[PDB]
Amino acid sequence: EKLPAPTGKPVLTISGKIGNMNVGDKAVFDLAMLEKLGMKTIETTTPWYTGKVRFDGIPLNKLMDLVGAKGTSARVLALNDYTTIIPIDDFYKFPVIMALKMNGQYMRIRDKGPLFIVYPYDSSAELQNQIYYSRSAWQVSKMIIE
Ligand SMILES: Nc1nc2ncc([C@H](O)[C@H](O)CO)nc2c(=O)[nH]1
Ligand SMILES: [Cl-]
Ligand SMILES: [Cl-]
Ligand SMILES: [Cl-]
Ligand SMILES: [Cl-]
Ligand SMILES: [Cl-]
């Protein structure tokens, strides 16, 4: 089905090698649109917090299927200047999510919110390294499929 236009203010903008766009050559999502997609939880320890933290968000695998991603990598840009490149295969290899809530509460824009890419770190020794930590971009605003 076609992808609708955002009614609310945009929180995420996907562009690049995508097949489904709603605003020009881009897939723009308001918070409401993101929540229409199924949610998944990740309960894991992290190098940013003490103990386990509960992350609720949308799996990036279904997010890629929704925009019809046809690239190999994803250039993730933070609200300011942070940049990270994630191989799309990570989304199919791992149940990575785009977190919206942390401990059942929306993330504050001042902290990691509104969007935060999280991997299930404690689920695999392989995920316990800087590679995956560096790709866990917070305050996400744009995604470019390359
Ligand atoms: N927005 C944003 N997200 C980030 N996600 C992960 C990491 C890494 O843990 C390291 O700090 C840098 O690779 N740094 C950042 C960062 O600076 N900014
Ligand atoms: Cl809004
Ligand atoms: Cl909204
Ligand atoms: Cl769904
Ligand atoms: Cl390609
Ligand atoms: Cl292992």
Q: Give which of 97, 100, 102 is closest to 52, Cα–Cα.
A: 102
65 contacts 90 by C-beta, under 8 angstroms: no
59 contacts 95 by C-beta, under 8 angstroms: yes
Compute, in angstroms, the gap from residue 87 CA to the centroid of ligand 2.
31
The DSSP bridge partners found for residue 45 are 52
In a domain, 4, yes or no: no
CATH number of the domain enclosing 43: 3.90.420.10
Joined together, the tokens standing for residue 62 give 């279904």
Query: What secondary structure letter does DSSP report for 24?
Result: T
This structure was determined by X-ray
Joined together, the tokens standing for residue 71 give 């690239």
15 contacts 28 by C-beta, under 8 angstroms: no
Select from 133, 135, 143 the residue to mutate for testing ligand 1; criterion: most ligand atoms less than 8 Å from CB: 133
In a domain, 109, yes or no: yes
3-state SS assignment for residue 34: helix
Q: Which helix (H) or strand (E) holds 143?
A: strand 140-145
Residue position matching structure tokens 């945009």: 10
Structurally, how many domains does the chain consist of?
A: 1
Compute, in angstroms, the gap from residue 36 CA to the centroid of ligand 4.
7
Residues lining ligand 6 (ion), CB within 5 A?
Answer: 125
HSE at residue 89, side-chain half, CA atoms within 13 A, is 2
In a domain, 3, yes or no: no
Cα angle value 34/135/3 (rounded, 5°): 25
Task: Measure Cα distances from 2 to 7, 10, 60, 142 in Å.
Answer: 16, 18, 19, 21
Joined together, the tokens standing for residue 91 give 């989304």
Compute, in angstroms, the gap from residue 29 CA to the centroid of ligand 4.
15
Which ligand 1 atom minimizes the distance to the CA of 112? 1
Joined together, the tokens standing for residue 117 give 């890419």
Query: What secondary structure letter does DSSP report for 6?
Result: P
What is the C-alpha to C-alpha distance for residues 81 and 126, in angstroms, rounded to an integer? 27
Q: Whose CA is nearest to atom 17 of ligand 1?
A: 82
Pocket of ligand 1 (CB under 6 A): 78, 82, 133-134, 136-139
In a domain, 128, yes or no: yes
In a domain, 120, yes or no: yes
Give the full edge-to-edge strand order of the sheet including 73-78.
Answer: 26-30, 10-16, 140-145, 73-78, 83-87
In a domain, 2, yes or no: no
* Residue 99 belongs to domain spanning: 10-142
